[PDB]
Amino acid sequence: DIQLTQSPSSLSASVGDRVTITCRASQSVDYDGDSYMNWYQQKPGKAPKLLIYAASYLESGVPSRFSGSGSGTDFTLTISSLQPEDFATYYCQQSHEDPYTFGQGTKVEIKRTVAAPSVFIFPPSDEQLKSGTASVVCLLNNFYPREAKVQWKVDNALQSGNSQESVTEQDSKDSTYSLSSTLTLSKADYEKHKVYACEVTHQGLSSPVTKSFNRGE
Amino acid sequence: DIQLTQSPSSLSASVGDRVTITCRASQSVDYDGDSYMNWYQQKPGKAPKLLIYAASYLESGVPSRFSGSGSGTDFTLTISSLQPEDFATYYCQQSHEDPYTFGQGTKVEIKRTVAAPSVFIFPPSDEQLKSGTASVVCLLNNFYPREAKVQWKVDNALQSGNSQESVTEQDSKDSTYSLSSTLTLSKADYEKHKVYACEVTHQGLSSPVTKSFNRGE
Amino acid sequence: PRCVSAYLSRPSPFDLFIRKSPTITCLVVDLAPSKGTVNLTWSRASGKPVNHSTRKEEKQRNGTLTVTSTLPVGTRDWIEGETYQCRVTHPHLPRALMRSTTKTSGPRAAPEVYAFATPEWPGSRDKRTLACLIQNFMPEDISVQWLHNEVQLPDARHSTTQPRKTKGSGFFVFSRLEVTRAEWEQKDEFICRAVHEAASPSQTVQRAVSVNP
Amino acid sequence: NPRCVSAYLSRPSPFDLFIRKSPTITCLVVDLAPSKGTVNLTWSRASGKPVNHSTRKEEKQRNGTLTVTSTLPVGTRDWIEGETYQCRVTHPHLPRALMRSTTKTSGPRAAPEVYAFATPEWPGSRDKRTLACLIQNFMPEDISVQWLHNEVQLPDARHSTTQPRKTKGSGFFVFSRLEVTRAEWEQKDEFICRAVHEAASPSQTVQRAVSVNP
Amino acid sequence: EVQLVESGGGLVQPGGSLRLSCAVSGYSITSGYSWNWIRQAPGKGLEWVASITYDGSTNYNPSVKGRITISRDDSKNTFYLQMNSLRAEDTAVYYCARGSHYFGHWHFAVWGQGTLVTVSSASTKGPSVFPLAPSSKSTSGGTAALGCLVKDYFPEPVTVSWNSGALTSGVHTFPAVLQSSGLYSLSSVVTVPSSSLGTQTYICNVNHKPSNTKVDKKVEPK
Amino acid sequence: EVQLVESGGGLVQPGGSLRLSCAVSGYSITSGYSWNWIRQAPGKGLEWVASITYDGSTNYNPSVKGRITISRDDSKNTFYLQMNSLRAEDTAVYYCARGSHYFGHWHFAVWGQGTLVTVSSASTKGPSVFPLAPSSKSTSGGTAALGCLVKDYFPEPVTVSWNSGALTSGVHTFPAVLQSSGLYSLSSVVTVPSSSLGTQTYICNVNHKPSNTKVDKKVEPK
Ligand SMILES: *[C@@H]1O[C@H](CO)[C@@H](O[C@@H]2O[C@H](CO)[C@@H](O[C@@H]3O[C@H](CO[C@H]4O[C@H](CO)[C@@H](O)[C@H](O)[C@@H]4O)[C@@H](O)[C@H](O[C@H]4O[C@H](CO)[C@@H](O)[C@H](O)[C@@H]4O)[C@@H]3O)[C@H](O)[C@H]2NC(C)=O)[C@H](O)[C@H]1NC(C)=O
Ligand SMILES: *[C@@H]1O[C@H](CO)[C@@H](O[C@@H]2O[C@H](CO)[C@@H](O[C@@H]3O[C@H](CO[C@H]4O[C@H](CO)[C@@H](O)[C@H](O)[C@@H]4O)[C@@H](O)[C@H](O[C@H]4O[C@H](CO)[C@@H](O)[C@H](O)[C@@H]4O)[C@@H]3O)[C@H](O)[C@H]2NC(C)=O)[C@H](O)[C@H]1NC(C)=O
């Protein structure tokens, strides 16, 4: 099998900057005056999209800021002017020998200015409060960088091991992230206490922000 | 003044891989058959070290895996076979017009296999307790990747807003990180409680690890 | 594929005979921007000094640089057969490129002008299309204008093809002008005018056309 | 004027495609040096189907360069479905191979509007008259034009057709010029300007007649 | 244009078998091109699995060969992937794709959206849908945040839309997180003008095909 | 070999004056080359400040110019940087470096290790040094961790060595953190064979030049 190695594994670059991705093949993919290495782009939740085939030929409908070069065992994909929508994993792929094989991929992240999150808190629905579980949800909306800290406080008693977090991929338009923190409590414990607070710490916040509510209001 | 833009801003690559950094100048730095762009390497705690001068000439004593290319306003530094000791921030710098100016820098990180942290905990010294303060320290040693979670629990009561963290740069030999978490308490509150615990969660740990001690022992 | 090419135009018959302010333009295509700028210089066979040319650079869609230089020339200088030369130098070429231009020589024949209007039909009720056939002229240098209500319409309101050879010896061109109901109701006369050195007198020939005759 | 080896690949003419039903595409290579070796010119299809026998042709030029062409017949349905055909050019003197690709073309469709005119008599041209045809507001830009006199189609060398230019709207326009003699319009004073375009419904045809003396 | 749509995915027991189908429209799979299956296990790279050309010639990746079959149905313009003796490592999103030809070699120019195959000895469970109610004074930006909590389901995926797809701007549907119970859970949120809370109705439409669940929960203020 | 060592850094009041000196050894500053000052503000890039050639010709960055002066003392083989009307933006690491000449242009082939200049109205405060004693809670198999807590000082930096530079392997001196008190704090740790805890002595040597503090704390087990 022909093994393909890509570098870098991951990179962060600003809008307008040049990005360079390298693909190395364990054996030559040359044949009859052409080099049969293909490049693909996979955005979040989507299937891979063909950018370039046979090393340097641009697939129809693909923006011109994508370009390919190289031969034998050495290939390069270039993004001449990086855009927010270019946030994706990029794969090289040889079609010279069976089985066809892909590289392990290169994650391209967009570097942008710092942005503090808009914080929201959501009490459990009356519907769920008939079910036995109580889910308190805290939303951190449109922030950068990805790193954030979320503290749950029930009557100012800090919680742990009863909450889970989920983060979106980088948005394709404004390159921000969004995070959800879900606190899971028994109905008994939920009704047992009055105050529910979600404290957020982020690089874009001068002071930790707290959003809260009183049960019953 | 000549402004220099570097890309990518940050990247992660594996040992043996090729790394590519681009430098763009606001105007041409060409003159008399040469291009006056210099490249520097800045490792942690150290001063910049000259790698390349005048676009493509390697400084004496610099490994051959470093090479420069380009002209006019377009320049490229290549690391042909990345090594653990190449962890550094790399700067371009034009010497064609006064004042001489540097790029903002490109951070090169080494991608390695996952490594779980060895966790250590340290009670406050008797010496410190006389000053009125008590510092409890938790050490996470030689792990990868950088992302880690540390929880302080005093008599199973979770802490917040009274601890601070610090992380080393990537080690130049094994490419791991080390982290310290310092819990700060008053002597009164410290002597009030019995159990101090440091719970660590990391990708290399199947289960969150806890290190703790009882005051007085 | 990238081919470094240079071109050098003659003055338009309009600038030459009407405005009496003729110019020539040296066009350079397929340049790399970050490879530095080209040097573009002018010369005359007589040895006389050249006027200050206006330099102009523009990045292109296909990622190349396009450099142009327009040089003003004396009307009498040009008509008497002066030769102007453009030379392009680049550190990377490195053999210079040179283009030359001079007054046209050969037989001369005035242009025949015919103007037509498209018939009315549903869809084109508030618009009509005027067409002008200009033929059997030589040399091929020619400028075309459209006039309505004795004012000259701006260029870009009409499209004009490049000179092609007739079965005879002369050349021909087509001109297309879309006009509006508002205009031909204001005045239903549109002039297709050609400027050509063989046109007697004043180097002008024209023909009128009406939407509703 | 340095000579740069360039390659071009055309689409089938609407005439060959809809009328003769014998569509072809041509790979044109220019600025070749005669005294240098000959190019290798090969074809390929996106579907993976085999390509037909192409007909090769070479020509010495006055400017001292060699011109190589390769014409490939294509399936009518294959092309119209939206097949992609490719031409590849290799030369030992060329650093990198040349590759051009061609396809059906997509986008909005509009039938062409045809208008035909005859010139008034000019002092001199007693026995010559010029016919002109305006064809406009069609898209895509591919279009073929023929002139018929007395129900027979005139040779293509008798008339000149301009290349498609953009209208101020969205469509394209072209002009066609036909010089005619007294002998012809006296035999029968009717000349047909016909346009072949995919958007013309039905049979991809639109035409208009014109007379010298109405 | 050509379109490719995969189906047959979902939950499968370990050691069980798998039948995937790719319905092709806009082009006939016997007229030309190659027709491939490619899979992508979670958080991992792409693996070409099998292919069948227009003339019936088949090819397989040795990594999974011997427990795999690719075939087609001309009358349905569909081709299939059959796998048996499945293991947890076969858990992946399975794409079908049409390969285009270039001088003896193929490249994957057209892809389907892919379908998730989950290998597990767990049972299917439809989600519970609870509203995330917008608040008074939700934002200084004159905007309000509301959503749907889609809780306790298995396997992936669920799809969430708002007002039957009419509302797309400002929507964030978070990745599912596996709870300690072994079931998945996520939230879908949207920011909206607070002035519209009285006027406009907001419905989240949740689909969980594995359990044949289709729900429309209206999210009202409180 | 050429060696450059800068000094004169530390705490300075806003509007106060600054003298940095670069003692050069192994080469004479009147014999050739250019001699430069380059600074690096926190979390930002490098800024060339000033230069003086072997023949005394001076050059300055206009950005910082008019409040600065570069000079030399041949008898001491030293060159200096003088700054006035210091501002918060002047807080940076100041490097001295020797520029080498190349056909009309210079590049910085030799650098000093830099000195930190902190501009603030606060007062200097020496650190307290506390031991991080090794114990079973700091021993994993055959390796034990021990360290020194260097707490409550200002400004930066402190320097930490172990056994007067004899012990370097396995040492991790963490970046200082600014506490809410406005004072800095850090730890230096080292892992060692737990078998050596009884036998081997471990001393951390803490230096804080701004307050002229010098500490040698022995770290004992349990
Ligand atoms: C990237 O994109 C740019 C922009 O389109 C391209 O630049 C063009 O390059 C082509 C050829 O490379 C040029 O074509 C030539 O133009 C000459 C100038 O004539 C112009 O003069 C004025 C002012 O423009 C007007 O009359 C009119 O606009 C004309 O276009 C012509 O003299 C040339 O004539 C050729 O054809 C005749 C017969 O048709 C031959 O007898 C001649 O020998 C000659 O071959 C020719 O038409 C074009 O002018 C350029 N456009 C611009 C805007 O600069 C780049 O080429 C492109 N890069 C690549 C790699 O394709
Ligand atoms: C020496 O002499 C020979 C013969 O005269 C010249 O060969 C010509 O070279 C030019 C370009 O260098 C060719 O022009 C190009 O033709 C392409 C296709 O042309 C044919 O296509 C159809 C079918 O034949 C006809 O409509 C057409 O008239 C031609 O017959 C075009 O695709 C090219 O398009 C250009 O313009 C468009 C927009 O207008 C751009 O998008 C393109 O990028 C491109 O710029 C172009 O027009 C010409 O066809 C060649 N003729 C022959 C007979 O080979 C040599 O150039 C000349 N060399 C020297 C050094 O003197």
Burial F46-76 (b: 16+ CB within 10 A, else e): bbbbbbbbeeeeebbbeebeeebebebeeee
Closest CA to E155 of E184, E113, E187, E186: E184
- What CATH topology corresponds to B112-215? Immunoglobulin-like (2.60.40)
Dihedrals phi, psi of F76, to nearest 5 degrees? -100, 0
**Are D97 and A33 in contact (CB < 8 Å)?**
yes
Please tell me whether residue D180 adopts helix, strand or coil conformation.
Answer: strand
Tell me how far apart the alpha carbons of residues D29 and D58 are, in angstroms, rounded to a whole number. Answer: 10
**B164-169, long-range: CB < 8 A, 24+ apart:** B164/F177, B164/F179, B164/F185, B165/F177, B166/F174, B166/F175, B166/F176, B166/F177, B166/F186, B166/F187, B167/F174, B167/F175, B168/F172, B168/F174, B168/F175, B169/B44, B169/B87
CA E87 → CA B20, E31, E94, distances in Å? Answer: 40, 35, 15
CA C94 → CA C89, C97, F141, distances in Å? Answer: 7, 9, 71
Judge whether F160 and F148 are in contact, CB under 8 Å: yes
Closest CA to B31 of C64, F102, C55, C87: F102
The residues that bridge with F36 in the sheet, in sequence order, are: F51, F97
Tell me how far apart the alpha carbons of residues A125 and E131 are, in angstroms, rounded to a whole number. Answer: 6
**Two tokens, residue B174:** 């094994």
Judge whether E49 and E68 are in contact, CB under 8 Å: yes
Judge whether E96 and E36 are in contact, CB under 8 Å: yes
| Ligand 1 nearest-atom number relative to CA C64 | 1
How many Å is the Cα radius of gyration of chain E?
Answer: 21
Closest CA to B137 of F204, F134, A152, F198: F134
Q: Please enumerate in sequence order all residues whose Cβ is within 8 A of that of C19, keeping only pairs 6 or more positions apart, or say none.
A: none
Which helix (H) or strand (E) segment holds residue D186: the answer is helix D182-187
Chain E residues touching residue D81 (CB < 8 angstroms): 27, 31
Q: Domain coordinates of chain B in residue numbers? A: 1-111, 112-215
Three-state secondary structure of chain F: CCEEEEECCEEECCCCCEEEEEEEECCCCCCCCEEEEEEECCCCCEEEEEEEECCCCEEECCCCCCCEEEEEEHHHCEEEEEECCCCHHHCEEEEEEEEEEECCEEEEEEECCCEEEEECCCCCECCEEEEECCCHHHEECCEEEEEEEEEEEECCCCEEEEHHHCECCCEEECCCEECCCCCEEEEEEEEEECCHHHHCCCEEEEEEHHHCEEEEEECCCC
Report the Cα–Cα distance between both ends of chain B, in Å, rounded.
64
**Are A33 and D88 in contact (CB < 8 Å)?**
yes
Alpha-carbon torsion, ordered D70, D75, D78, D79, to 10 deg: 50
Report CA C4 to chain centroid distance, whole Å.
Answer: 23
Tell me how far apart the alpha carbons of residues C29 and C65 are, in angstroms, rounded to a whole number. Answer: 7
Judge whether F133 and F172 are in contact, CB under 8 Å: no
- Give the amino acid at E169: S
Closest CA to E216 of E203, E199, E197, E201: E203
Dihedrals phi, psi of D186, to nearest 5 degrees? -80, -30
Please tell me whether residue D52 adopts helix, strand or coil conformation.
Answer: coil
How many Å is the Cα radius of gyration of chain B?
Answer: 24
Tell me how far apart the alpha carbons of residues A166 and A180 are, in angstroms, rounded to a whole number. Answer: 5
Ligand number with the minimum distance to the CA of C12: 1
Tell me how far apart the alpha carbons of residues B66 and E94 are, in angstroms, rounded to a whole number. Answer: 42
Tell me how far apart the alpha carbons of residues B170 and B168 are, in angstroms, rounded to a whole number. Answer: 6
Taking CA–CA distances from B11, the nearest residue in chain A reads: A11
- Give the amino acid at C102: T
Closest CA to B95 of F57, F27, F34: F34
Tell me how far apart the alpha carbons of residues B135 and B190 are, in angstroms, rounded to a whole number. Answer: 9
**Two tokens, residue D70:** 């390769």
Ligand 2 and D63: CB distance under 6 A: yes
Tell me how far apart the alpha carbons of residues C35 and C63 are, in angstroms, rounded to a whole number. Answer: 13
Q: How many CB atoms lie within 10 A of CB C105?
A: 8
How many Å is the Cα radius of gyration of chain A?
Answer: 24
Tell me how far apart the alpha carbons of residues D121 and E126 are, in angstroms, rounded to a whole number. Answer: 86
Tell me how far apart the alpha carbons of residues D147 and D159 are, in angstroms, rounded to a whole number. Answer: 8
Q: Please enumerate in sequence order all residues whose Cβ is within 8 A of that of F75, keeping only pairs 6 or more positions apart, or say none.
A: none
Domains (range + CATH), chain F: 1-121 (2.60.40.10), 122-222 (2.60.40.10)
DSSP chain E: --EEEEE--EEE-TT--EEEEEEEESS-TTTSSEEEEEEE-TTS-EEEEEEEETTS-EEE-TTTTTSEEEEEEGGGTEEEEEE-S--GGG-EEEEEEEEEEETTEEEEEEE---EEEEE-SS--BPPEEEEE---TT--TTSEEEEEEEEEEEBSS--EEEEGGGTB-TTEEEPPPEE-TTS-EEEEEEEEEEGGGTTT---EEEEEEGGGTEEEEEE----
Three-state secondary structure of chain B: CCCEEEECCEEEEECCCCEEEEEEECCCCEECCEECEEEEEECCCCCCEEEEECCCEECCCCCCCEEEEEECCEEEEEECCCCHHHCEEEEEEECCCCCCEECCCEEEEEECCCECCEEEEECCCHHHHCCCEEEEEEEEEEEECCCCEEEEEECCEECCCCEEEEECCCCCCCCCEEEEEEEEEEHHHHHHCCEEEEEEECCCCCCCEEEEEECCC
Residue C201: cis peptide before it, omega within 30 degrees of 0 = yes
Length of chain A: 217
User: Given ligand 1 and candidates C8, C26, C27, which is best to mutate, with the most ligand atoms within 8 Å of its CB?
Assistant: C27
Q: Please enumerate in sequence order all residues whose Cβ is within 8 A of that of A15, keeping only pairs 6 or more positions apart, or say none.
A: A82, A83, A84, A110, A112, A175
Tell me how far apart the alpha carbons of residues F9 and B62 are, in angstroms, rounded to a whole number. Answer: 30
- Of the candidates D90, D99, D103, the beta carbon closest to that of A57 is on D99
Dihedrals phi, psi of C13, to nearest 5 degrees? -55, -25
Tell me how far apart the alpha carbons of residues B60 and F25 are, in angstroms, rounded to a whole number. Answer: 20
Judge whether D207 and D114 are in contact, CB under 8 Å: yes
**E136 interface with A at CB cutoff 8 Å:** no
Chain A residues touching residue D90 (CB < 8 angstroms): 33
Judge whether B120 and B130 are in contact, CB under 8 Å: no
**Two tokens, residue D188:** 């029968």
Ligand 1 and C155: CB distance under 6 A: no
Q: Please enumerate in sequence order all residues whose Cβ is within 8 A of that of D124, keeping only pairs 6 or more positions apart, or say none.
A: none
Please tell me whether residue D137 adopts helix, strand or coil conformation.
Answer: strand
Judge whether C40 and C28 are in contact, CB under 8 Å: yes
Please tell me whether residue D122 adopts helix, strand or coil conformation.
Answer: coil
Closest CA to B14 of D83, A169, A22, C117: A22
The residues that bridge with A186 in the sheet, in sequence order, are: A133
Are B1-111 and B112-215 equal in CATH topology? yes
Q: How many CB atoms lie within 10 A of CB E141?
A: 10
Residue D8 CA to ligand 2 center (angstroms) comes to 8
Shortest alpha-carbon distance between residue D21 and chain C (Å): 31
| Ligand 1 nearest-atom number relative to CA C66 | 54
Ligand 2 and D13: CB distance under 6 A: no
Domains (range + CATH), chain D: 1-104 (2.60.40.10), 105-212 (2.60.40.10)
Closest CA to B107 of B194, B42, B52: B42
Chain A residues touching residue E147 (CB < 8 angstroms): 122, 137, 139
Three-state secondary structure of chain C: CCCCEEEECCCCHHHHHCCCCCEEEEEEEEECHHHCCCEEEEEECCCCCCCCCEEEEEECCCCCEEEEEEEECCHHHHHCCCEEEEEEECCCCCCCEEEEEECCCCCCECCEEEEEECCCECCECCEEEEEEEEEEEECCCCEEEEEECCEECCCCCEEECCCEECCCCCEEEEEEEEEEHHHHHHCCCEEEEEECCCCCCCCEEEEEECCCC
Tell me how far apart the alpha carbons of residues C122 and A33 are, in angstroms, rounded to a whole number. Answer: 57
Ligand number with the minimum distance to the CA of D163: 2
Ligand 1 and C161: CB distance under 6 A: no
DSSP D13-48: PHIIIIIS---EEEEEEEEE-TTSPPPEEEEEETT-
Judge whether A58 and A112 are in contact, CB under 8 Å: no
Tracing tokens 């019936």 back to the chain, one arrives at E56
Q: How many CB atoms lie within 10 A of CB F1?
A: 6
- Of the candidates F45, F106, F140, the beta carbon closest to that of B95 is on F106
Tell me how far apart the alpha carbons of residues D197 and F113 are, in angstroms, rounded to a whole number. Answer: 77
Judge whether E185 and E152 are in contact, CB under 8 Å: yes
Tracing tokens 């001063």 back to the chain, one arrives at B47
- Give the amino acid at F92: A
Q: Please enumerate in sequence order all residues whose Cβ is within 8 A of that of C4, keeping only pairs 6 or more positions apart, or say none.
A: C28, C29, C30, C31, C93, C97, D2
Tell me how far apart the alpha carbons of residues C207 and D194 are, in angstroms, rounded to a whole number. Answer: 28
Chain E residues touching residue A101 (CB < 8 angstroms): 48
**Technique of determination:** X-ray
**Are E103 and D47 in contact (CB < 8 Å)?**
no
The answer to whether chain C touches chain E by having 3 or more C-beta pairs less than 8 angstroms apart is no
- What CATH topology corresponds to B1-111? Immunoglobulin-like (2.60.40)
**Are B12 and A14 in contact (CB < 8 Å)?**
no
Judge whether E190 and E147 are in contact, CB under 8 Å: yes
Ligand 1 and C70: CB distance under 6 A: no
Query: Best interface-test mutation with C: which of D130, D138, D147, D180 has the largest number of C CBs within 10 A?
Result: D130
Q: How many CB atoms lie within 10 A of CB A38?
A: 30
Dihedrals phi, psi of F102, to nearest 5 degrees? -145, 95
Judge whether D43 and D85 are in contact, CB under 8 Å: yes
Ligand number with the minimum distance to the CA of C31: 1
Residue B117: cis peptide before it, omega within 30 degrees of 0 = no
